[PDB]
Amino acid sequence: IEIGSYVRYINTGTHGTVKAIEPKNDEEWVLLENDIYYRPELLELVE
Amino acid sequence: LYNPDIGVPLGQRKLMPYKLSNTDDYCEGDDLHFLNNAAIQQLWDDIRRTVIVGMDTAHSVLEKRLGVEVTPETINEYMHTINHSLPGGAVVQEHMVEVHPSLAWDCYARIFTGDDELADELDSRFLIDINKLFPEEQAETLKAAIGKKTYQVSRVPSLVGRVCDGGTISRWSAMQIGMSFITAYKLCAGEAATADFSYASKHADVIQMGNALPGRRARGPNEPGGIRFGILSDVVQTTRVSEDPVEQSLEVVATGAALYDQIWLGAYMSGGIGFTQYATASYTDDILDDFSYYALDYVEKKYGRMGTKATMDVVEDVAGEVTLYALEQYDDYPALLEDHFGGSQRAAVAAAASGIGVCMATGNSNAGVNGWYLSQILHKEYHSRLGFYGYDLQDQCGASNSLAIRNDEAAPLELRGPNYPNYAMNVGHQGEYAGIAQAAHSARGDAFALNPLVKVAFADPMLVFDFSKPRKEIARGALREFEAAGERDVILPAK
Amino acid sequence: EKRLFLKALKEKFEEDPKEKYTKFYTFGGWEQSARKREFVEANEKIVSEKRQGIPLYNPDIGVPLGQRKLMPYKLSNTDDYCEGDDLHFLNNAAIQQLWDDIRRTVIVGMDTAHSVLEKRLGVEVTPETINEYMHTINHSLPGGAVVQEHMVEVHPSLAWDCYARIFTGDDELADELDSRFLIDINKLFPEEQAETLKAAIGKKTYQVSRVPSLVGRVCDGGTISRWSAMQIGMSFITAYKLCAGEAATADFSYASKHADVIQMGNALPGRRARGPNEPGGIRFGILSDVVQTTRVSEDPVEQSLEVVATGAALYDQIWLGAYMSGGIGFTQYATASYTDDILDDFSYYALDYVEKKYGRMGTKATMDVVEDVAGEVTLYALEQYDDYPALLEDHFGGSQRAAVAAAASGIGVCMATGNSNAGVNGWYLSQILHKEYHSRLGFYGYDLQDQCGASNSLAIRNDEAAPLELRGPNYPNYAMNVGHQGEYAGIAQAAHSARGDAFALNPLVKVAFADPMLVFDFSKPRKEIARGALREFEAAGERDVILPAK
Amino acid sequence: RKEQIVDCRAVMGLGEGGGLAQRGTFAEGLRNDVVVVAMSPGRRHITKPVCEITYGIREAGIQTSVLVLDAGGGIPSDAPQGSLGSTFGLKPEEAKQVNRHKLCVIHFGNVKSHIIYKARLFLKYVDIPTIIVCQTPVDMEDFAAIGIKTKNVMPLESKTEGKIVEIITGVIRGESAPQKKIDEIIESIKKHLG
Amino acid sequence: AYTPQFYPGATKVAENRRNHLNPNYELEKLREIPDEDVVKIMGHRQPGEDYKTVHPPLEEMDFVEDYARDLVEPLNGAKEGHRVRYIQFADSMYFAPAQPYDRSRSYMSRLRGVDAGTLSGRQVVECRESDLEEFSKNILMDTELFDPATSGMRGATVHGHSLRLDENGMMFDALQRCVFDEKTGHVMYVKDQVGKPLDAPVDVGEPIPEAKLREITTIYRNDGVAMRADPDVIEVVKRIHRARTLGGYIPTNETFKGL
């Protein structure tokens, strides 16, 4: 997982490109192209 | 200070339970939907699955063509046979399959006769006794109308009418009647006399609840669009258990609303939500009961139950008085107005009361509908509103069509129905029309309205739906304590 | 000799299938069958409890049942046996759901509605708005009322079988739509079939509405279209918020629920007075398109025989034995066409003969090929009946024999030529050849349409001419008699299975009934009927939540 | 096992044969742990799915209050193109009564677009973790798509101060909730409360 | 010529109905709402921008020669080809100054080229947008036909014509298009007639006092003016009913002798 990758949300399958990683409250968060934070454990890499 | 995120509370009245007229049961409005109420479904099922066959031509064929002698013992044997064959048992043709008896526990073949000597030596298991079920005067009237004739009532299983349509019932009864005839009298399985039996039981001596509607309407027989108002009046059995004319007319109004306005119009000719609050307005609270009792009191105070002959003046007087009283009651009590929030509900209730009053004054059903239409066009001027637009189509042409004699417009209100050209589309009219037709005869204390055979047939105690007190049964169904037939749980897996 | 029906005959009959003699009157009557004993026990309990002593089921009157051995019934291509009583349409929930799923289906095209919304109404239409409309109609179709708590609504558990689905021949729109309520042609059909169906459909969008089964149970079949139209209109005016007038709303209403409506059946005239969506209005091509075995099987005989089974169960059992006659019914005649592999064996022989002689579709439809193929198949079937006495005992009625042999002949002719009317002509030739062979045919009035058929097969007169795909139960010759219509549907399907066609009459019906959300899976009708006969079929329309437990 | 005392509402129910609760009313369970929020006192919400959750929590040993919203039916006025049919809202006193509880359990319906915006308006004024009990399968991300704080899927620009802490699907309005759903709700409350 | 009466009756309600039906009766104006404010509440177009058209101007399009069709002078909105829009009102049963059938009759008696539809709790008139705005400001909103409390310009969700009024005497609204400003005593429209919020609320005046409502209402009520107190209207209604019945039975001069 890194900026510019392609990820999909496992629960719904929304496709987007990772914009930035913005840790908060000692917890990793992933920002996609839809300006929505996600969780790395609920995201996985696709090619 | 204006906060747009406070919201607006809505529907306070609809949260409160709906009482049922002449009962003491409170039910939710969601439980009065015809899909959620098993009692309304069973009402329609019992009406749909009933066919009356006159077993007199068949006896004459057996006597004069086949040389077979018909005696009460032979009729008892035939009844025993048909009670086994009609649900789907096998009588001839070795190697048949049979329907599960658990799915046809509501299937009965009953016999009634106006001949007392023949009714005496008949098995009381299969006999609909007119003497026992009706008071003396009503029993005598029904026997005089029926005559020395024997009739068979076939109630095919409800599952049959639920899988198939309503046109299945007459054919089902005819096939089973023919089979029972050829196996009870030891005849050849197929000859000319068999065709005579089949023709008699298929159309010559058969009585259908509803006529077919071919063409544009496109429906088979025994559908709610084919049931005339007099037939539905004769289905309701309050006339033989109560002497209050208003109560009889109002039970017929409740049954007519629940059948026509709910089932026929909100499902057969519409869909989705349907028209539940349009129909329950006539049988939930005593509003219609109070208006009808006021109409009867006024009529008995100035005219009498049959003290006047139907003229225009009495129609104007009674309909105007009852309409003014009903609208004044709506004005005086905001609870009544918020109960009947829609204009159509109010218009139908006031016009039904006015028509019932005119019928109780004159004993004529066409005068009753004339009073109903006067009430509608007087309501319109009183409140400057009638109902949803599209409601007063028949109410505008009504006055002209009520006493008309032209081919497309003339019919006695007992002979009218949902297939009457004006009445064919709009809700909020038909159940009240049936009630007015019944009130035309409750004024005279008549035993029946249009068909004595239907009255005797639905006086049967083995029907699943109790037609003596339709509102009580509707309330029972709304409270999930009404047992309905047509369910198939013996052939289904455990859930 | 190896025959496909041999194994069933071994299982059904204790003696050799070629043995010409047996013994009778030693089985105890109706006690030999578990179904009859269960019926007797039930009847006793019901009589005593609910009927207050009025008798219901009396085996002691009428014919003494069970003087012979009551045989069990296999189901073709399925390894499960059932009694004949389990295959009665009233005792079988699978057959009831088969009719329910067809009855409660209406297909409405949504392209005129979109065009009217975009141009006349000034409302943009996007895949997001289509998804919103689909959500609205899925909530509102069963019983829902949108953002109106004061409105009466149907209990949700009472209509768990109600769905609203969408499909389209536009690929980009299809992949832009939500997969929750989409019938994907690409992933449901093989590649060539999907391409053919998309080309036939075009770039248009269609919605399928499955009205809840209970609605069709309480009401008739003509209620389905009205229910669908009303809910579609409500959902359209709720999803898209529009500021135009009321007249423009009337134009939109016509465009949305009165323009591209496809019904399963038409209304019937005369003494058959009935509304739409009744089994007597379903054309043979429509029923062939309803069955989805062209999706999962490349065998033409199997594709035709599944349509034969479905058409038998519908036309012969439900339509004819209940809608038109009633009583115990015509289960016998229909089970004869799909119980043992008798028709399977005959049709496989017909296909083999055609492939060896004329090729799979190697000849143009001429009279000579019709005559020789039909004659050969009929002779083979009749000698099969002759030299296997157990087979003749299994198909005891003449009608059930005639229909099976003639169906084999018609399927063979349709294989050879690819023309459905040639196949029906072969059917009629088979019928008269059968009559001359065995000096027998069906019942008293079985061959009304078989003596009139040869002349009406290729006729061009107004009330006599129609392609077999466009014929149905309302065709004047086919109106009354049992044992024909399901086989006619099978022959109509076989006309197209020979060509490897993706559909027979209507692509939209095929795609609509490819839907995985249906209760009855039309990919394997025989398997589902077998499941229903075992009381393992979950049917819809049960009012369990509005009835007392006691 | 400890005594549980409820402050019954001060107003009566809906008529004679109707419901026992009244719209826009609050019944404090003394020790404030969980508040169950019902959209209306009607049969679609009260005693069929809501009092069942109430007695499940009260059986688990956790005191419960039940609040019936004054205007709980409909969609908020801030929904796209406004509301239709009815307007959903939360009163300041209702918000204060909710906010003194450790956790909130709220029962929602079928349509997803309605539930998301109703939850957004609800959490605009509620600052305690809440559990959404709905019928439809809704993913714990569509709320974040419109700005709602969510435990698993946070939004970049949060428009609410409340956290949707759990979503439970399969509870139908007006129908008895099976013991499995009650057990799931109790487990979520226990693990997200103490 | 023929000098028209307009309605039977001697009560104040009958007189008010006659006044609404009379095109020569100048309705008393009770407020002043600017044209742009009316357009904003109507919610169809943005004020200041040109009207959208449905067809070219009548001069551009070519029509066949039609002597009878050309006898009628078209509306200006028709001449320019403007689209047809609507304005809808809900009237309270508690002494609202105008009522549905009264509204429809007055509209079809006073305005040209209008489409009026009547429901129990609704009344809508459709016309070309420019003329619709003109007579909505001049007649529908500024005059006594409109009371901001008991009547409300509202499409979409209409409900409350039969419910009781709220604490300020305002008709019930499920969307709350108009709210009562207690500081100034005026009614302000915070949403347009379909329900989308307005950027700036528009002042539509203050509620008419209840005595004036009693004096100018067109509804019959047991508490204010009963139909029994107006026997002349009942007699005319009964005459219409009897004439309809006799004409539908046998339409001859002999059967109408029993009129």
Ligand code: F43
């Ligand atoms: C909400 C609508 C939208 C529309 O197209 N029709 C509605 C709604 C529709 C839906 C409700 C379900 C839904 O999801 O919309 C259905 C069931 C249509 C049908 N299939 O018969 C219905 N109305 Ni309506 N509708 C009713 C009624 C009414 C009364 C309400 C009066 C009031 O002022 O509150 C008025 C008609 C009138 O003005 O006279 C009315 C209007 C309206 N009715 C207008 C009003 C808003 C509009 O301008 O768009 N209904 C009633 O008067 C009671 C019976 C009730 C019907 C259902 C029942 O019988 O249970 C229902 C009958």
Ligand code: F43
């Ligand atoms: C009384 C009739 C006249 C008529 O209109 N129908 C009958 C009887 C009827 C009844 C059987 C009633 C019962 O179970 O006792 C029903 C079910 C029709 C109904 N809905 O009532 C029926 N036949 Ni018939 N009927 C059948 C058949 C047949 C075949 C029987 C062949 C033979 O062995 O002789 C013959 C026709 C023939 O002339 O060849 C036949 C005749 C006859 N069939 C002859 C004379 C029967 C007799 O044995 O006395 N059925 C069959 O061929 C199998 C299918 C079977 C149908 C039920 C099912 O599918 O299970 C049944 C269909």
Ligand SMILES: C[C@@H](OP(=O)(O)O)[C@H](NC(=O)/C=C/CCCCSSCCS(=O)(=O)O)C(=O)O
């Ligand atoms: C079958 C259909 O015929 P038609 O629509 O072609 O006239 C016919 N329906 C109607 O006439 C009209 C249907 C509307 C339902 C009744 C309205 S109740 S609520 C709507 C109030 S309004 O705003 O429409 O005035 C019927 O018999 O149900």
Ligand SMILES: O=S(=O)(O)CCS
């Ligand atoms: O044998 S008949 O032709 O009468 C009917 C067969 S079921």
